[PDB]
Design a binder for this molecule. Structure first.
Ligand code: PQB
Length: 330
């Protein structure tokens, strides 16, 4: 066990191991605050998220457990992974704080070769994630941390402007049909289109407007898709709206690489059974310059049985401590 040091930066208190020096506060969030930090052991710059209020409620307790379990499991070039996890607490009883340490990236979310590399990496990262039955579910430019090699990593959570709903698959925002992993692909689509044009594709001012903007482009659900809407409420809503034709995506993404536009038509379909998977998306002609199937690996199986559990603050708290204790750096 290493020795720690204390620090107040931005009204929040920080208790890290000496091995992490020069804490620079660089971003904040709903579930915590990230500091930049130099790691004396590896000689690398790293990020440190101190989870804010990790064990305040059953919802916080579970969430904290969830975050740790996922980062511990993520091992991939395009997905943010745990370099170190620690706590100033010397026992489970005192255990009140959780710090997560990962790589320092650079920034967030240009030429068609850039879009290609960036989107390639996101989709290489969603192939993996998706392979372990995980769905990012809130994929957006600010969970996409790039450095100057242009090298991408998917963040579990971003930093703090961009509305989440600007990037949500209709299905999982209007709760309107059975959803699958391909909710992230809708987002990648929305992200990809932004990189190409410079403009948010679906810059909606709320749920109803968002749906208006998506339908402008993609067209109202036809009889084959209306068929799969499970909500009495939403079928009503859709069918009542004034009917819109589907657009030619070349007329909307003009001068964009025709292969880029083909990938877009393939990602931005309402019918989540038709939508292109990550694994499929990589084999698209658009990525010819980077696609390599012997190097788009899948992930170890991931036990999310815990998601279906109702436990007590203290129990979750204990499982998390377990995961701190059971860590091994790479
Ligand atoms: N690794 C990162 C970053 C970054 O590296 C990052 C992201 C965007 C911008 C950014 O700025 C870097 C420079 O401005 C400061 O050196 C860093 C932001 N959050 N996280 C993160 C940390 C610990 C976790 F457990 C989970 C996620």
């Amino acid at each position: 066990r290493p020795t720690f040091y204390r620090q107040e930066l931005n009204k929040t208190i920080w208790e890290v191991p000496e091995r992490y020096q020069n804490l620079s506060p660089i971003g904040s969030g709903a579930y915590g605050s990230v500091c930049a930090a130099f790691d004396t052991k590896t000689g690398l710059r790293v990020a440190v998220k101190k989870l804010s209020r990790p064990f305040q409620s059953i919802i916080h307790a579970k969430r904290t457990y969830r975050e740790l379990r996922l980062l511990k499991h993520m091992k991939h070039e395009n997905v943010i992974g745990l370099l170190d996890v620690f706590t100033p607490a010397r026992s489970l009883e005192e255990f009140n704080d959780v710090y997560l340490v990962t790589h320092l990236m650079g920034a967030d979310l240009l030429t068609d070769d850039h879009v290609q590399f960036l989107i390639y990496q996101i989709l290489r990262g969603l192939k993996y994630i998706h392979s372990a039955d995980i769905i990012h579910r809130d994929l957006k430019p600010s969970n996409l941390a790039v450095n100057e090699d242009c090298e991408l990593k998917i963040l579990d959570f971003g930093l703090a402007y961009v509305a989440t709903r600007w990037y949500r698959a209709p299905e999982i925002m209007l709760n309107w049909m059975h959803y699958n992993q391909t909710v992230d692909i809708w987002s990648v689509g929305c992200i990809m289109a932004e990189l190409l044009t410079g403009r948010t594709l679906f810059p909606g001012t709320d749920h109803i407007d968002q749906l208006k903007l998506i339908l402008r482009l993609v067209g109202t659900p036809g009889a084959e898709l209306l068929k799969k809407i499970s909500s009495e409420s939403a079928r009503n809503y859709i069918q009542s709206l004034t009917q819109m034709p589907k657009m030619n995506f070349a007329n909307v993404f003009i001068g964009a690489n025709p292969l880029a536009v083909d990938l877009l038509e393939k990602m931005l379909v309402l019918d989540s059974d038709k939508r292109i998977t990550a694994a499929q998306a990589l084999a698209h002609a658009y990525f010819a310059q980077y696609h390599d199937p012997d190097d788009e690996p899948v992930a170890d199986p991931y036990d999310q049985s815990f998601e279906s559990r109702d436990l007590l603050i203290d129990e979750w708290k204990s499982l998390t401590y377990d995961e701190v204790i059971s860590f091994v750096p790479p």
